[PDB]
Amino acid sequence: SGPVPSRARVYTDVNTHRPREYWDYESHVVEWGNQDDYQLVRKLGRGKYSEVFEAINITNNEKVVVKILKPVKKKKIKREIKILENLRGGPNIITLADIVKDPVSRTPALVFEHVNNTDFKQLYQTLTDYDIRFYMYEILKALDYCHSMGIMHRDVKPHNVMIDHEHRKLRLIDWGLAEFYHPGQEYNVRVASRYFKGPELLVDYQMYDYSLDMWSLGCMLASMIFRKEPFFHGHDNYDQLVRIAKVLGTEDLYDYIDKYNIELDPRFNDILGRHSRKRWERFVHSENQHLVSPEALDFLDKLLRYDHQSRLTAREAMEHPYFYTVVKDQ
């Protein structure tokens, strides 16, 4: 019969009511800048699609960040450029300062505002209960904005959340996997990091929406309050769903499979088995108890759901009793 279609529960037809050039990124003309305005200082890291350097804008002695793109299809480059321009000025969204062509790579190199990042492998172990709520609220402001703009990030993870802890500043980065949401469109399920892949990606349900980003957020929240990064630490795509099934149970998983008439890879038969839905108190101990609370568990439970339709929206999440103390201080 085929899989049952699905629509986004919020921001469904926002892109349809936009001018074509808003989401038709293939017809976007890149306005290149002067590459000689930036001198590379040092390399900051290497990804699979780019290399990131710290540079200086010699026109005004500003610290910038140059992301030299590894060779990929120009369609994916135009997509990232168009999304960054559409989201420019949004809350906690990284700002694209300029676009230049690199001398050596002969490749697009995106220039961004600099963010003095604190490594999450060092920051998360020092986060208090209030620090987690504050930053979760800042990520939610960025996610709610880009979702309202008809865009899903599809790669939410601690590495893609730059935090300047001294100034309590946060920027959501790495929009190379972001995509415009269109009702009824079937997307590539091989997106995001394996630890943050939603169940819809693991069971290959291609008609997903913004709710994919909310699952990844729950994975981040679980890692921070339980002091286990990553929380679902799987070896592959199949074992990733098994790690999830050992916590959320298998009864809800097969209900999610029966609801959307998803056909399972037969490999999942011999590895999934039967598992009960575990209570979050199982993962609470003396080292993380100061970060776990009834608010945190209720908020986490409303994010980690098999059914992507039943997850909280970014705006609904911002109105949870978990962020009450954050909102009044803001």
Ligand X SMILES: O=C1CCc2c(oc3cc(Br)c(O)c(Br)c23)/C1=C\Nc1ccccc1
Q: Which positions ≥6 away from 255 have C-beta within 8 Å?
A: 306, 307
Q: Tell whether omega for the bond before 158 is within 30 degrees of 0, i.e. cis.
A: no
Which helix (H) or strand (E) is 100 found in, with range? Answer: strand 96-101
d(CA 242, CA 89): 40
Q: Which is nearer to a second copy, 271 or 327 (CB)?
A: 271
Residues in 51-70 at the binding interface with a second copy, rule: CB under 8 A: 59
190 binds a second copy (CB under 8 A): no
Residue 252: other Cβ atoms inside 10 A: 16
SS3 318: helix
The catalytic residue among 98, 144, 155, 213 is 155
Which one among 116, 125, 185, 310 touches ligand X, defined by CB under 6 A? 116
33 binds a second copy (CB under 8 A): yes
Which one among 38, 112, 124, 180 touches ligand X, defined by CB under 6 A? 112
CB of 143 to a second copy, least distance (A): 23
CB of 261 to a second copy, least distance (A): 26
d(CA 202, CA 216): 13
The partner in contact with residue 278, picked from ligand X, a second copy, none with C-beta cut-offs of 5 to 8 angstroms by kind, is: none
Q: Is 47 annotated as a binding residue?
A: yes
117 binds ligand X (CB under 6 A): yes
Bin 286: left if φ > 0, else alpha if -120 < ψ < 50, else beta. alpha
Which one among 98, 138, 144, 213 touches a second copy, defined by CB under 8 A? 98
Q: Note whether 51 and 68 are within 8 A (CB).
A: yes
CB of 229 to ligand X, least distance (A): 18
The partner in contact with residue 205, picked from ligand X, a second copy, none with C-beta cut-offs of 5 to 8 angstroms by kind, is: none
Q: Which two tokens stand for residue 166?
A: 């001294």
CB of 229 to a second copy, least distance (A): 5
d(CA 106, CA 100): 10
Q: Which is nearer to ligand X, 55 or 222 (CB)?
A: 55
The partner in contact with residue 44, picked from ligand X, a second copy, none with C-beta cut-offs of 5 to 8 angstroms by kind, is: ligand X
Q: Note whether 94 and 162 are within 8 A (CB).
A: yes
Q: Which is nearer to ligand X, 75 or 328 (CB)?
A: 75
**Residue 119 annotated to the active site:** no
Tell me the per-residue interface mask from 151 to 190 with ligand X, x by CB under 6 A, - otherwise: -----------x----------xx----------------
d(CA 63, CA 97): 11
Q: Is 278 annotated as a binding residue?
A: no
Residues in 213-232 at the binding interface with a second copy, rule: CB under 8 A: 228-230
Looking up tokens 């060779």 gives 71
CA 277 to chain centre: 25
- Dihedrals phi, psi of 116, to nearest 5 degrees: -70, 90
CB of 293 to ligand X, least distance (A): 31
d(CA 165, CA 100): 30
Q: Which positions ≥6 away from 196 have C-beta within 8 Å?
A: 155, 156, 157, 215, 216, 219, 220, 230
Q: Is 2 annotated as a binding residue?
A: no
CB of 100 to ligand X, least distance (A): 15
Q: Which residues bind a second copy (CB under 8 A)?
A: 29, 31, 33-34, 48, 59, 85, 88, 96, 98, 193-195, 228-230, 233, 235-236
Residues labelled as active-site residues: 155
